[PDB]
């Protein structure tokens, strides 16, 4: 119960696994930065282990912080 966005696809608030708040956010620019950007990770996977820098990454835990524009209305 935390991030209310992405997290293993379009999700729906899910808020990743347990950890009891928080949402590891990673990905955004796939790896081609060829425009767009709807292939993120921001999934959580415990307690946001931070992971690595690479493409895009972060770590929130304040209700959410792993959104994603564009998306698909279906």
UniProtKB/Swiss-Prot annotation:
Q: Which cysteines are joined by disulfide bonds?
A: 3-23, 16-44, 29-33, 48-59, 60-65
| Tissues with expression | Expressed by the venom gland.
Record's keyword terms, sorted: Acetylcholine receptor inhibiting toxin, Disulfide bond, Ion channel impairing toxin, Neurotoxin, Postsynaptic neurotoxin, Secreted, Signal, Toxin
> Which GO MF terms does the UniProt record name?
acetylcholine receptor inhibitor activity; ion channel regulator activity; toxin activity
- Please state the protein's primary subcellular location: secreted
Q: How does it assemble?
A: Monomer in solution, homodimer in crystal state.
Miscellaneous remark of the record = Is identical to Alpha-bungarotoxin (A31) from B.candidus (AC Q7T3J2).
Protein's UniProt name = Alpha-bungarotoxin
Q: Which organism is it from?
A: Bungarus multicinctus (Many-banded krait)
Region of the whole protein represented: 22 to 95 of 95
């Amino acid at each position: 119960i935390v991030c209310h966005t992405t997290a293993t696809s379009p999700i729906s608030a899910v808020t990743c696994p347990p950890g009891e708040n928080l949402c590891y956010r990673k990905m955004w620019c796939d790896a081609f930065c060829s425009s767009r950007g709807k292939v993120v990770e921001l999934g959580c996977a415990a307690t946001c282990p931070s992971k690595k820098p690479y493409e895009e990454v972060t770590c929130c835990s304040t209700d959410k912080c792993n959104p994603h524009p564009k998306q698909r209305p279906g």
